[PDB]
Amino acid sequence: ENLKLGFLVAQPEEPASQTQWKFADKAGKDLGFEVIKIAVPDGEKTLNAIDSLAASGAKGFVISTPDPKLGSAIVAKARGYDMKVIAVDNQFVNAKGKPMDTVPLVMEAATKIGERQGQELYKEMQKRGWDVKESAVMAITANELDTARRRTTGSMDALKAAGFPEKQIYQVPTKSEDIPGAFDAANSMLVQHPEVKHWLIVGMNDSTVLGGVRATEGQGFKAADIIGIGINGVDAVSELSKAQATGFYGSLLPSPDVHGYKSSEMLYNWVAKDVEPPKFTEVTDVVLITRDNFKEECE
């Protein structure tokens, strides 16, 4: 009696994780299953929660792994327990760091959120009325990462498609995904292109775009002459909460409510109705938080 399904999140203190749990519970009510919620901040507690789920009689679970390289261990343990597994937000990888494509995955498409970035950059640019002749794109890239590559390519593609001149899009590889690496990359771009008066900053995440913005400050560029939009809002609140407006215009955040609901629904259909999910299930809903709205928006 009464189907039980797990929902495991790495970071239960995060508003987004709490939202995932909320909307999984909503999936449970709507479809008739009980949600067992367990925090999994490390590999030990990850393995424990699975053992715990098995003993409770859960037939499957959704997980946002705290470490992608936990994938093999997760898959093997779940298999011995005959429990269905769906990954949310973070893709599993093997011992060689190649993505495990066998485990169904539910998240935003990296290209699509990249494209959304390029669209919003161009929209903020058109709004400010920059002369496109004295303007350019600084794309800080980490192309050896697949998700970064797809974000920055998507962003640049959307920018090109919206009519930004391909000749004024400049790329620079970052040596690390921190502020420092992005700052070093942004710096070398600024020195190689002083004829530029207005910069659009493309990058894969908040931290990358922020290194961008920080480097432009050091070179005397004003906020009004710099547009950068982050992805996933890791730094968005503190930066947008500042007294003054900066070159960091906003951030793109995938909707955790849809991630939570949809993953749970796919898991239920698998377990209760024997409908195997596809390898990848794209969730599109993405919100832009700016200074103007991050109060009402981070509700």
Curated annotation (Swiss-Prot):
Site annotation The binding site for the sugar molecule has not yet been established, but C-87 may be involved: residues: 64
Primary location class: periplasm
InterPro entries to which the protein is assigned, alphabetical: AraF, Bact_Solute-Bind_Prot2, Peripla_BP/Lac1_sug-bd_dom, Peripla_BP_I
Superkingdom: Bacteria
GO cellular component: ATP-binding cassette (ABC) transporter complex, substrate-binding subunit-containing; membrane; outer membrane-bounded periplasmic space
Annotated GO MF terms: ABC-type monosaccharide transporter activity; carbohydrate binding; monosaccharide binding
Annotated protein name in UniProt: L-arabinose-binding periplasmic protein
Family classification: Belongs to the bacterial solute-binding protein 2 family.
CDD domains: PBP1_arabinose_binding (cd01540)
Function as written in the Swiss-Prot or TrEMBL entry: Involved in the high-affinity L-arabinose membrane transport system. Binds with high affinity to arabinose, but can also bind D-galactose (approximately 2-fold reduction) and D-fucose (approximately 40-fold reduction).
Localisation per UniProt entry: Periplasm
Pfam families for this protein: Peripla_BP_1 (PF00532)
Keyword set, alphabetical order: Periplasm, Signal, Sugar transport, Transport
Stated induction or repression of this protein's expression: Induced by arabinose. Transcription is dependent on the transcription factor AraC, the cAMP receptor protein (CRP) and cAMP.
SUPFAM superfamilies assigned to the protein according to its UniProt record, in alphabetical order: Periplasmic binding protein-like I
Any one biological process term the GO annotation gives: L-arabinose transmembrane transport
